[PDB]
Amino acid sequence: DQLTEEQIAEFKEAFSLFDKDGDGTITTKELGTVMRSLGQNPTEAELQDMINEVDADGNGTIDFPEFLTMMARKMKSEEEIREAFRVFDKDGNGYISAAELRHVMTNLGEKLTDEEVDEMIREADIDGDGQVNYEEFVQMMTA
């Protein structure tokens, strides 16, 4: 793990500050409850945007791996990025193909559809070549 055991335990404790019913997910109602206890007043639409920033499976709620995306974007490492790029780019040509992205998703037990993979490549593919090179990969991970 890149994160230490103490870190994962800590961030799980933070997650349960929002997941007050302990069902493993953070809802817009739970997010709103914490935000108003800290003196804010988000709208229901603004709660939806906050979840949509990190909702990776599109089910409208934040699970713990999604929550770590908020934790990483909260406060921020370029050797881990090179190393991770190589996991994606398995034939070593410096480009992540749709097939290589599907392979990462399969090895991680992530369910996949062509629509979602094609969208992921499209959004990262700044130069329009149909694949994701290293600099396109950096912009995606660090933003």
Binding site: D1, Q2, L3, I8, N52, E53, V54, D55, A56, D57, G58, F64, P65, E66, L68, T69, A72, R73, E80, A84, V87, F88, V104, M105, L108, G109, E110, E115, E116, E119, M120, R122, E123, A124, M140, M141, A143
Partner: peptide
């Protein structure tokens, strides 16, 4: 899926690639 959803999904895969212990039920 949308452009916000795409970026969220890339970053989730990054977390999972770097932290194998987070894959699966446990």
């Amino acid at each position: 899926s949308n452009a916000k959803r795409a970026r969220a999904h890339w970053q989730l895969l990054y977390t999972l690639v770097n932290n194998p212990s987070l894959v699966g039920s446990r």
